Design an enzyme around this catalytic site. Structure first.
Site, PDB file in Angstrom:
ATOM      1  N   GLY A 129       0.822  -1.195   0.000  1.00  0.00           N
ATOM      2  CA  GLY A 129       0.000   0.000   0.000  1.00  0.00           C
ATOM      3  C   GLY A 129       0.861   1.251   0.000  1.00  0.00           C
ATOM      4  CB  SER A 164       7.008  -3.310   2.273  1.00  0.00           C
ATOM      5  OG  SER A 164       6.113  -2.905   1.248  1.00  0.00           O
ATOM      6  CG  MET A 165       2.595  -1.155   2.909  1.00  0.00           C
ATOM      7  SD  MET A 165       3.555   0.225   3.563  1.00  0.00           S
ATOM      8  CE  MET A 165       4.348   0.827   2.074  1.00  0.00           C
ATOM      9  CG  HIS A 200       9.910  -3.591  -1.240  1.00  0.00           C
ATOM     10  ND1 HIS A 200      11.140  -3.411  -1.835  1.00  0.00           N
ATOM     11  CD2 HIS A 200       9.019  -2.921  -2.009  1.00  0.00           C
ATOM     12  CE1 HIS A 200      11.000  -2.664  -2.915  1.00  0.00           C
ATOM     13  NE2 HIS A 200       9.723  -2.353  -3.043  1.00  0.00           N
ATOM     14  CG  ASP A 230      11.866  -6.608  -3.539  1.00  0.00           C
ATOM     15  OD1 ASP A 230      11.692  -5.781  -2.621  1.00  0.00           O
ATOM     16  OD2 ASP A 230      11.593  -6.365  -4.732  1.00  0.00           O
TER      17      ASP A 230
END
Lengths: 205, 95, 193, 174, 194, 227, 179, 172, 194, 193, 174
Positions: free
Chosen positions: K50, K79-80, K104, K153
């Site tokens: 996001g 990553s969120m 990430h 990543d």
């Protein structure tokens, strides 16, 4: 519904103006293997009275209940408006209402044989199902005819007399009933029975 | 009560009525063929028994009274409407 | 837009049924005309003597969709009082002219616009002259109905209906679209001496 | 939501006023006339503009109200809300001290045939002559001063809008 | 409301029901601007044709009632309401002023001890739909509800000149030249602030 | 309505709120046909016809039709289901009828086919499209001949005309007025207003074909000599 | 409405057959079998086509129903509804006297890898082979005759559908059927 | 579709994505909380879906302390058939004319050349996770699962019982 | 609430109306973080100024009450509540402990014998149970109801040391240094297991 | 968008509306500004003495819509306590700065952006200079009220808000945007020796 | 569905974290602490990523409440949600044995002048240095190895995520 009691006490007190009964006869764990369609498990359970509570408090006057501990109260097991309070030694104390009181059955500790001899206690009336057609003038429904066997007393009157006004129906009268109007019963002899409340009693036929 | 036996006299706590149907079905090709559901059916009482458990009905046979929109059963016996009215659902007579 | 405006608009229209007021809004389509036909026959059923104050505000619409709106007002038993709020169109002012004589009202700042019905033709060479006869059937009947409402002749109607013609409420009394003007009395304004 | 204030005789002129957006407000203006023709009706204006044929239906529906008319501006009144701000009763037209008021000629479009340009130019000149007569009524201004100010876009503060005649009393203080 | 064929005209209401005729639709007082159907603030201010077994009111009395009092009937070629005895307020005098009402049932007529200028000329006000606090002075009181124990009617403990608190949206509101007048229950009084 | 159509309904009661407009009208044995007659709304009209069949078997089920056309097989399923029920069906024609909605108003019972004054009716041969190989082109012309032979004997049973009059009318685009459709047998009664007896221009052309009106004496009719 | 026919055990199969519309009919078919395994279930089929994957689930749902089923064909039955028409109980298959019956193989698109093409090529042939041997049981027809009639893309009038074995009875006394 | 929620029936329809997987495990949190003894019957009909969306509903069914039942409706293409094989032994049912397809799941590689090789290792880890768990559910060897999962292979419900995909069929 | 006018300087309640004064505006009990939105687990119990026509309420009682008991009013700058006698829980003693809060109405206080965590640290597929069965034990009983036959208040057969399988979400809930205290109905005792 | 989350979002904002918590929805335009001023003009019915919690989260928006929220916050009788969680734009931080002095709370992880407001101009030659003057009028009023709220000079606001200027609430408490931060006291960790 | 478990403090972070989607998570988070501040709040994680400022809005709102926080990860957290997985307190960070953990660095955006590029460059340089201070707190990892892990990543299995300090327990044990 199926609540376990604490260990250091075993004597359950009722829900004030309610009925405390016990039944473990003709359950799933029984000696009979061959049975009738499931109205046989919906038979009079013959719940023995352990202890009766106090009267109805209500809005400030004590109301009587017209019951005795020396009887076997019939109640509906599918009508789950009660509690199943089980003890540690396998005893199950069931706390039912005064509206759940169906009636009394002579020779109660037996199979569904004395269903025509059922005498009601609360506001109920025993109706014998007559072997007729169900709907012939419909296309909306039509009720089936029935004959009265036993009558019971009604509810408590709030007047100054304090008497229980009985049902004005009489044994031997022809009445009408619907298939969803009450609790259906079945006998092995082929005769069928139903119990309706006094507010569902409409007229004779 | 009025189908299996000829003694259609009900119990002391209820009476029988016959609602009158109007000729609104003819104008259904243009208009809405009937009235919306409402009270005041304007029915004549066939059998009158005054005394009951609730308050009595000081009315004669053949007169017309007002009805509530609930607490009554409906049935059709010999092509006419019959509504099982209670004695507590009566307010007064009309003209 | 957001449905909260639609929910608060659905409430005030539902209160208009209790005062016997129907709503003609937006473009006259096939689905909206069926919503207005069913709402006119219901108001006759609760009472067949009281009038129905028809709210007319439409910027246009189909020609055959408004034809079902026209003849359903003349055959019902009570009269329909039509009012012009905001703007009338070729299918809007035809609803305005279809009201009862002596009960057609308007506001002095609304616009009454009338013209010949639009459309188009596409297809084979025989499909052109047939579809041209459909619009001329809609042209001659609207000019025939407007001559009976306003009381004018046949030739003076088609000389004004062939083009887009706007009308003022002050000249609509002299022409025959509306019968009266409903307005509050003005304030006693002093002159400049 | 907005239903709690609709019972308190409050309406909202929110968003761009289209043909359907004007239909929701003028239908509410006659329900509040039907509920009580004595109590006050307050109109809250927040609009970025709109058409002349839809915004003229709000003016005559507001003037049809026999009761008192209160008009309060909240935010932007771009070429349509400024005309409805002065259209209320004198002594009740108010505005917030940091709102923008823009007066402008009513917009219009012309297309189709060349003979439609005969008709589309006349309704613009009719709407210009109608609005300049109304705007010179409650403002106590001559017609020469109105036409030279509405010819272009003219933003103004509520300080000079008080002496012009659009508002009557400042409600935010200074 | 249903049309009735006129057969015998011998109305006798059973119980405490009262059949009463609507007099007029306020004689078209607001006629001239669009003639709108508006909210009625005087329900069935007319005479009673048939009493039944009610004893608090006479036949030729002009009595006001509530909005949801009874079911409407179209008898006698006009509109009629069939209502009970529990919702009566009181008789009208020769003058139709609402301040001169004496309660004939378990009702209390109060005015409202509020300021005469709450809007202050149209200030930016809101949230005036209060529910718990309100004020009201008493003009007249009637006889209370029938007690089922002693079989007698008792007057409530309230004077005729004190300011008493009450509850919002209980009862019917009236207007007499800008002055508000609300009729409340008996049994709707909290404390006399006097 | 260009942007949105609000819910135009009324439900009012002293104790409880009632249903919307189309649910209340369906309970009064009145069915509405609006929009395009595709396969989706075809089950709505047939399913409501079976819903009111189980309620009462003697009351007249009324169907209101206002559609500019539809699918030829979906409009075929509502006719034969309407003819295979017990009670009579009173049809009312609304708006316009373009070659499929004119069939269902002619499929009503005799004496109950009511059309309004400004209703447009139309009868043509069914259309279609060619697709691919010659084994499907021959299947296409055999399908269009099957739809033409089925719809031919539909009008022979409900109107009682000859097959030569149907082939001369359904050859090209033929629009019929209800005053003309009453002579053809499509409807049974004309619906007018309070003495509304205006003459449509299709009858003025019909009066010119028989020789009742000329250019010198136009009578109290509309002008038709502007061709 | 649709809920009034549901309590009278009558369901509708309208529109194009999709995956979202498939399990809605299967979920209400097993609810009627659990309520009353003796009362018949009447269905109404009006479909202009559909997928062969979701259409077989409607056929397995009627075979899973212990009670008898009744079918009714109104409107259209194109390549999926004609298979569900004859799949009911023999002797209780009715329809409209002018409804159309289309017996044709289902369609399908193929794209991708070279090994991916030959998998779905024999898959739609196995769907063609399974649909032919199932529809040949209740029709009392030989396999070689019923496998070539489904290749012709021509509709079928209900007059010749009776002796073909796909349908049993026609509502209307079999005189209203037009050629 | 609300009548199936009271009968402990959830619907797995269409391609599985993130909002469907959040709704599907939300119905599984409620059906075990009202009763931890009665089973939950699921009608699986999916033509595929995401890699992590099918793995988000696989693990939460193993946490249900009573067993579950899975019934194939129509077709399960390479993502729904994994939900069938993860059920309880003796409770895996299927229609007699349904279809079971086993294939490696779809998935892209967008980004840098260093990024597309480190994210293809996860797809190679997803292939070892899917074929590693499917070999324990069917009882077959490790080689025969990795041999047929590269290309699409449709399986009849009659041969799905001997292979180990389902346990029985409902014919009646 | 509204500011009252300085016109009367008198309060006389009628019927079952008892005036109570608010203690303070949260008394800064949440100081240190100063918490502009925090928990209010006490409905401002205070002293009594006027009695009116109350039966069991005394002038020197520290009456606790529900949040919806009556109408709020600002008597001379201080907030005041005119509660009803029907929905009173009890009165507070001299100490601020809630265990000594003896009831004077149709209410029964219990202690509680439930688990402090139904999740046991947090586990998936959990957090749902039936709302009716629970465990609790009685510490003290309040007053009973008036009898029509004897004209006296009689108490039901319940002791001060029984465990009760009561019903959840009835009344309210408080806390005393980690110990819970719940008030139930009277009419909420399934069994007197003592 | 998913329509299932709309009724869940409407439920949680209505339960916080009983606790006097309002929300700034997305970019500030005309549809939410009439909805937001309806929420601040309704919370005074319960009590007009206690504070009003305002959740501030806006990524941008127009100019005149945020000014209609600014004047009503400083006019009503109870104090409005703004709370910025997430990201505040130039109009969002102006709403946050328009709260009560000493009651403007936040958390130290947000981002505060202040700049001159965005705009455009389209028309003739004299139309350009007219619409450019009202942007500079909106430049003077936004920078003029921020100089009174933060207490800085006139030159300080125009030279910092000339472009995108992102701040943290640890440094916004020195400028004058946020009065105090809201954070629970953490337990002291055993650091390395 | 989601409303049947919302009364027991169940938060589902489904779908992509947007401006309207994350705001529905923040607005329901303030409801749960205001009704009861002593019991724990469970937050489920299933999201493919996001926005940077919207996804940061869930972390500081969960730190605003004074009660306990439980976090569970379903499927993929890119990553969120993975930054929000370790955001809870130590001891109650459980994860599924097959859930993928993606680490990430966040993205950015700039369109205008070249001086507007460097404003957004130091704005995302401040956000990168902000989360590296936060992620090193609940993981007990130095800043040298935690900056290179966010560079490329890396999809992480929960077997190595237990010793990394991001999660605390594994539901099921294997």
């Amino acid at each position: 519904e199926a609540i376990s009691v604490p260990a250091p006490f075993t004597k359950v007190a009722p829900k004030g103006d309610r009925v405390l009964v016990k039944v473990a006869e003709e359950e799933v764990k029984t000696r009979g293997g061959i049975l009738l369609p499931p109205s046989a498990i919906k038979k009079p359970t013959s719940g023995e009275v352990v202890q009766l509570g106090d009267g109805r408090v209500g809005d400030g006057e004590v109301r009587p209940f017209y019951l005795q501990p020396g009887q076997t109260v019939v109640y509906s097991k599918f009508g789950f408006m009660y509690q199943d309070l089980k003890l540690s030694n396998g005893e199950e104390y069931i706390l039912i209402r005064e509206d759940d009181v169906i009636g009394i059955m002579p020779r109660a500790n037996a199979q569904a044989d004395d269903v025509p001899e059922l005498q009601p206690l609360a506001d109920r009336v025993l109706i014998k199902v007559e072997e007729v057609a169900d709907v012939t003038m419909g296309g909306k429904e039509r009720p089936l005819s029935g004959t009265v066997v036993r009558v019971g007393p009604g509810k408590y009157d709030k007047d100054a007399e304090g008497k229980r006004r009985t049902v004005p129906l009489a044994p031997g009268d022809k009445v009408l009933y619907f298939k969803y109007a009450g609790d259906n019963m079945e006998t092995p002899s082929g005769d069928k029975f139903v119990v309706l409340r006094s507010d569902d009693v409409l007229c004779k036929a | 009560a009025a189908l299996d036996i000829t003694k259609m006299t009900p119990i002391h706590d209820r009476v029988l009525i016959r609602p009158i149907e109007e000729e609104q079905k003819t104008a259904g090709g243009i208009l809405l063929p009937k009235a919306p559901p409402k009270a005041n059916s304007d029915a004549h009482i066939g059998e009158v028994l005054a005394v009951g458990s609730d308050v009595t009905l000081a009315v004669a046979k053949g007169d017309m009274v007002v009805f509530q929109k609930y607490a009554m059963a409906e049935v059709e016996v010999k092509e006419g409407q019959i509504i099982f009215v209670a004695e507590k659902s009566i307010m007064g007579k009309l003209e | 837009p957001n449905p909260l405006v639609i929910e608060r608009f659905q409430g005030v229209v539902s209160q208009l049924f209790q005062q016997r007021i129907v709503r003609l809004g937006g473009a006259v389509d096939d689905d909206m005309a069926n919503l207005l036909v069913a709402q006119l026959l219901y108001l006759d059923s609760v009472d067949n003597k009281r009038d129905i104050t028809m709210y007319v505000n439409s910027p246009g619409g189909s020609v055959t969709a408004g034809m079902a709106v026209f003849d359903t007002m003349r055959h019902i038993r009570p009269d329909v009082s039509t009012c012009c709020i905001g703007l009338a169109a070729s299918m809007g002012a035809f609803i305005l002219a279809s009201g009862q004589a002596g009960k057609r009202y308007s506001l002095p700042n609304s616009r009454i616009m009338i013209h010949q019905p639009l459309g188009g033709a596409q297809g084979q060479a025989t499909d052109i002259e047939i579809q041209a006869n459909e619009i001329l059937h809609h042209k001659l009947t609207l000019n025939g109905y407007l001559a009976q409402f306003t009381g004018q002749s046949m030739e003076t109607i088609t000389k004004d209906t062939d083009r887009d013609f706007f009308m003022s409420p002050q000249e609509a009394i002299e022409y025959g679209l509306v019968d009266a003007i409903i307005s509050k009395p003005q304030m006693l304004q002093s002159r400049e001496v | 939501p907005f239903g709690l204030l609709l019972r308190q005789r409050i309406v909202f002129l929110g968003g761009e006023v289209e043909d359907f957006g004007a239909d929701a407000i003028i239908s509410q203006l006659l329900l509040l006339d039907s509920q009580d023709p004595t109590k006050d009706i307050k109109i809250f204006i927040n609009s970025p503009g709109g058409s002349v044929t839809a915004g003229m239906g709000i003016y005559d529906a507001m003037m049809l109200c026999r009761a008192d008319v209160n008009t309060y501006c909240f935010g932007l009144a771009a070429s349509m809300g400024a005309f409805l701000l002065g259209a209320g009763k004198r002594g009740k037209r108010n505005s917030m001290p940091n709102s923008r008021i823009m007066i402008h000629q009513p917009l219009g479009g012309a297309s189709g045939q060349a003979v439609d340009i005969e008709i589309q130019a006349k309704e613009i000149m009719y709407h210009k002559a109608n609005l300049n007569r109304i705007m010179a009524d409650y403002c106590q201004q001559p017609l020469s001063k109105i036409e030279e100010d509405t010819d272009r876009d003219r933003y103004m503060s509520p300080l000079e809008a008080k002496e012009y005649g659009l508002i009557d009393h400042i409600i935010g203080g200074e | 409301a249903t049309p009735v064929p006129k057969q015998f005209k011998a109305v006798k209401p059973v119980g405490d029901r009262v059949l009463v005729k609507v007099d007029k639709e306020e004689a078209k007082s607001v006629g001239g601007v669009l003639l709108p159907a508006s909210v009625r603030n005087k329900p069935t201010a007319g005479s009673i044709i048939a009493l039944g077994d009610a004893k608090s009111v006479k036949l030729s009395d002009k009595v006001i009632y509530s909005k949801f009092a009874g079911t409407e009937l179209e008898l006698g070629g006009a509109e009629h309401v069939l209502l009970k005895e529990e919702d009566v307020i009181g008789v009208l005098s020769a003058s139709e002023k609402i301040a001169q009402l004496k309660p004939l049932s378990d009702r209390i007529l109060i005015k409202g001890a509020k300021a005469e200028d709450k809007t202050s000329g149209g200030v930016l006000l809101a949230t005036e739909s209060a529910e718990k606090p309100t004020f009201g002075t008493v003009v007249a009181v009637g006889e209370g509800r029938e007690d089922e124990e002693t079989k007698a009617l008792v007057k409530p403990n309230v004077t005729v000149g004190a300011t008493v608190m009450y509850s919002k949206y209980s009862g019917t509101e009236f207007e007499e030249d800008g002055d508000n007048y609300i009729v409340v229950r008996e049994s709707d009084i909290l404390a006399q602030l006097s | 309505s260009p942007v949105v159509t609000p819910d135009i309904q009324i439900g009012h009661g002293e104790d409880a709120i009632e249903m919307d407009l189309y649910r209340y009208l369906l309970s009064n044995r009145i069915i509405f046909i609006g929009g395009y007659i595709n396969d989706k709304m075809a089950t709505q009209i047939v399913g409501s016809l079976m819903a009111l069949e189980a309620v009462d078997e003697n009351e007249d089920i009324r169907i209101y039709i206002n559609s500019p056309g539809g699918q030829p097989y979906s409009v075929l399923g509502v006719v034969d289901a309407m003819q295979s029920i017990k009670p009579d069906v009173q049809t009312v024609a609304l708006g316009a009828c373009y070659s499929y909605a004119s069939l269902v108003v002619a499929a009503g019972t005799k004496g109950k086919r009511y059309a309004m004054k400004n209703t447009r009716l139309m009868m043509t041969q069914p259309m279609g499209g060619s697709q691919g190989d010659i084994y499907q082109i021959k299947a296409t012309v055999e399908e269009l001949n099957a739809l033409y032979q089925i719809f031919s004997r539909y009008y022979m049973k409900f109107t009682g005309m000859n097959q030569d009059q149907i082939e001369q009318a359904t050859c090209r685009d033929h629009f019929m007025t209800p005053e003309q459709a009453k002579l053809e047998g499509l409807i049974d009664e004309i619906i007018r207003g309070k003495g509304d007896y205006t003459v449509p221009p299709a009858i003025v052309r019909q009066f010119r074909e028989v020789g009742l009106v000329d250019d010198l004496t136009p009578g109290p009719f509309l002008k038709v000599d502007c061709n």
